Structure 1
Amino acid sequence: IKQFYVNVEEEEYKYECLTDLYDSISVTQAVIFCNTRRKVEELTTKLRNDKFTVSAIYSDLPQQERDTIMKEFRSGSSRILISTDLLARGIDVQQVSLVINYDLPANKENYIHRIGRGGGVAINFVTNEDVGAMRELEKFYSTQIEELPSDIATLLN
């Protein structure tokens, strides 16, 4: 799993960075994690308005609804699956090649459950306010989270 970060500088630039990235890296399906249900719902709404097909999973969903959502994703009906930090470990991201942390994990431990299973590329969005916490992450683990390259056309090969 290759781990990168994009310094979006401020929360407001995250949405545009996500959609531009989505096009630039030419990926089809991706999983996105946010730290709160509210952010998941808001990002899902914006994405859908922009014509993207998205599925969202929340804790308040009964097992039936979650299993439906997953089938929606696995079949390709939805190109994007968005979930919360709390549900990351319970989400069986298949061999999805791209995972995006729209919000940098606030719980350092949960980070390894938010980077996929090898598809494997994980991209972390950080603002000037989160950059520090990211460094702590690199220490908490013995890994290296590199700044995303200027040219990612061949990112996921």
Structure 2
Amino acid sequence: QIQTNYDKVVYKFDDMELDENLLRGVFGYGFEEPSAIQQRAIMPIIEGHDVLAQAQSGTGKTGTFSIAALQRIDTSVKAPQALMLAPTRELALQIQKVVMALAFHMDIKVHACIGLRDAQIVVGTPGRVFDNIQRRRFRTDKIKMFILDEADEMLSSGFKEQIYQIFTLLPPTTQVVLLSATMPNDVLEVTTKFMRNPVRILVKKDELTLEGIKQFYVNVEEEEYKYECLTDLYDSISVTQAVIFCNTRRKVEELTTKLRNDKFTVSAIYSDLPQQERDTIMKEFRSGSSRILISTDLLARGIDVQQVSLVINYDLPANKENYIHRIGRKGVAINFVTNEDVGAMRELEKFYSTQIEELPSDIATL
């Protein structure tokens, strides 16, 4: 855990003196307002400082350094001017997709390293990028910016020496940006040694609350009655999309196919799926392909509670701890409680010191 030492936030992209071609890129990609890190770290990177960012994934990390870098690029110079490093080719392919997308309206070649003596931004993994420098396959004398994404993962996947080497093969005035979710001794070593008086930024994930959402319950009395209550719910209130949580993978899947028979369009996620598979399911759902997402709990943690108005706890959380992860921040949470669930729902009652009124006949309004 590192401490912040830079006190300058910029709230709007308009206030970042970006180039039009780049600004068009950022907007036409989906970004409208900078996230936390982006508010704090785009401008220091552009101004020349070494930036040390401790930030979790899904905070806007890739967009922070991709924007700063494009802005800094000199389209006149047709050589590598920035090197972006990542632990995996998957991750470096992502970063490339993004860098390219923000760059749509500028003349900047981006090459991936897993015909690169003329790329202006280079992206790859530490081994392949080392080998390629050594084989004199890519010009490093124009490199002005070295971005190490997920330094912790890179050091923990056996990339220490490759990185140390790379540091010493780039112009000794290369600016360094290092981003890491964790800051263990190993990563601080890279920092003390290879960085100069870095701007240190720490973005801590925002704690979830229940205040935002209005929670209700429905006494289905018995388990055999849960489904029938769900279908009637959809006769009663108007839904854009919903998330439904069950405890087991079996019920997720049984419920999924029961709903499809009734002509619902539904997406299911549970633990055994590849992290890539879940990622696609969530993305396609958040884009409107399906209108219901059913999920287990083990991954109520990696899940993204977007503007989804409605959340239904079809099963009640066996572990008290995961009720916040299912329905935490405005929206609506509706729990299914059977006769045996009542004492369990008293636990949630007092664990959060929160109130969960019974579902009113007047809801189609609320």
TM-score in terms of structure 1 length: 0.93
Instruction: Give, in angstroms, the shift of residue 22 of structure 1.
Output: 2.1
DSSP 3-state at the match of 2:301: helix
The structure number with the bigger radius of gyration is 2
Distance 2:328 2:294 in 1: 13
Shift of 1:98: 0.5
Is contact 1:6–1:147 with CA below 8 Å preserved after alignment?
yes
Give distance in 2, aligned partners of 1:30 and 1:61.
21
Matched, 1:2 2:208: no
The alignment status of 1:74 with 2:283, answered yes or no, reads no
Deviation at 1:58, TM superposition (A): 1.2
Q: Report the Cα distance in structure 1 between the residues aligned to 2:300 and 2:327, rounded to whole angstroms.
A: 9
Shift in Å at residue 90 of structure 1?
1.2
Measured against aligned partners, the alpha-carbon deviations of 1:58-107 in whole angstroms (never above 9, x if no partner) come to: 11111221121012201211000010011112111211110000001110
Residues 99 and 116, structure 1, Cα contact 8 Å, conserved in 2: no
Which structure: greater strand fraction?
Answer: 1
Query: 1:101-133 CA distances to partner (integer Å, 9 max, x unpaired)?
Result: 00011100111111143xx10000000110111
SS in 1 for 2:245: strand
Q: Is the CA contact 2:301–2:325 (under 8 Å) kept in the aligned structure 1? A: yes
Match of 2:342 in 1: 131
Aligned mate of 2:321, from 89, 104, 109: 109
Bigger drift between 37-46 and 139-148 goes to 139-148
Asked if structure 1 preserves the Cα contact closer than 8 Å seen for 2:240 and 2:309, the reply is no
RMSD (Å), alpha carbons: 1.0
Shift in alpha-carbon separation, 1:90–1:44, aligned structure 2, 3 A? same
Aligned to 1:85: 297
RCO higher in structure (CA 8 A, sep ≥6)? 1
How many residues were matched structurally? 152
Q: Report the secondary structure of 1:46's partner residue.
A: helix
Structure 2 residues not aligned, in runs of 5+? 1-212
After TM superposition, give the deviation of residue 142 of structure 1 in Å: 1.2
Q: Secondary structure at the match of 2:300?
A: helix
Shift of 1:28: 2.0
User: Alignment identity in percent?
Assistant: 100
Provide the rounded CA distance (Å) in 1 between the counterparts of 2:298 and 2:234. Answer: 24
Structure 1 consecutive aligned stretches of length 4 or more whose deviation exceeds 6 Å: none
Cα deviation code 1:28-69 (max 9, x no counterpart): 200000010000000001001111000001111112211210
Are the aligned partners of 1:116 and 1:122 in contact in 2 as well (CA < 8 Å)? no
The Cα of 1:151 is off from its aligned counterpart by 2.5
Q: Structure 1: how far apart are the matches of 2:287 and 2:328?
A: 19
